Amino acid sequence: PPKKPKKPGXGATPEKLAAYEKELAAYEKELAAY
């Protein structure tokens, strides 16, 4: 099963947050495919 990405907390930067959105959408895609 695809690993769930962790949200940057406390000190998140928009770039890493965007990467989180990408990896989250990817997680949803791989979870859906699974």
Side-chain angles (χ1 to χ4, degrees):
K3 182 183 186 62
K4 180 188 176 301
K6 300 176 184 300
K7 177 187 177 300
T13 54
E15 295 64 43
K16 292 198 184 60
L17 218 63
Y20 169 71
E21 282 302 309
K22 173 195 173 307
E23 295 307 275
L24 180 60
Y27 170 73
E28 292 184 283
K29 289 181 180 59
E30 276 300 279
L31 179 68
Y34 188 83

